Amino acid sequence: KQCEIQAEQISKEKEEAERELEAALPALRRAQEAVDSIESKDIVELKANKKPLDIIKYIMDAVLVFFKARLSYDESGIQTLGDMNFMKKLKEFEKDSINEETIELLEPYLNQSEFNDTFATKASKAAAGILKWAFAIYEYHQKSKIVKPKRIQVAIAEGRQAIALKE
């Protein structure tokens, strides 16, 4: 009977964690729909620019440290965007992979003057959508650590109920 009660509790906790993830996604889905409605005319026009603008550079340093590419060179980034899989990887990274020492080191680097959707939209029609999406990730870790515990709770509660029935 502890196995029965814990199975039901695991199911309820996993459902609640999935609901919370979908709720913190309420943004991740429109970022992702706008990232998806970006005409390609604009990304393309900007990859080719001579120097990066300071804003577009700094966003891009961290977009890249997330992606495990811990290097500050511009060239390291043009390299990473060049790929078209990036048009799908735009819709594939999940949030559970983030590490604690990473978020520890990125956080000094978020330059608040510089990051914004409408200002950054005049610099470029397409810069607008990504910003929103990174944020939907830094805004899911710990929060990812805490919400992977929440997800396991509905998820962790379902798994614990199964293990309890087995025992």
Describe this structure in words.
This is part of a larger assembly, with one chain. With 167 residues, the chain is mainly α. 72% of the residues lie in helices and 0% in strands. The protein has ten helices and no strands. α1 (2-24) runs antiparallel to α10 and α2 packs antiparallel against α9 (127-138). The chain is elongated, with a radius of gyration of 19 Å. It is classed as motor protein. Keywords: axoneme, outer dynein arm, pre power stroke, dynein, motor protein. The entry is titled "In situ outer dynein arm from Chlamydomonas reinhardtii in a pre-power stroke state". The protein: Dynein heavy chain, outer arm protein.
What does the secondary structure layout of this molecule look like, with pairings?
Elements: H1 2-24, H2 28-37, H3 40-47, H4 54-66, H5 74-82, H6 85-89, H7 100-109, H8 117-123, H9 127-138, H10 143-166
PDB class: motor protein
Keywords: axoneme, outer dynein arm, dynein, motor protein
Entry title: In situ outer dynein arm from Chlamydomonas reinhardtii in a pre-power stroke state
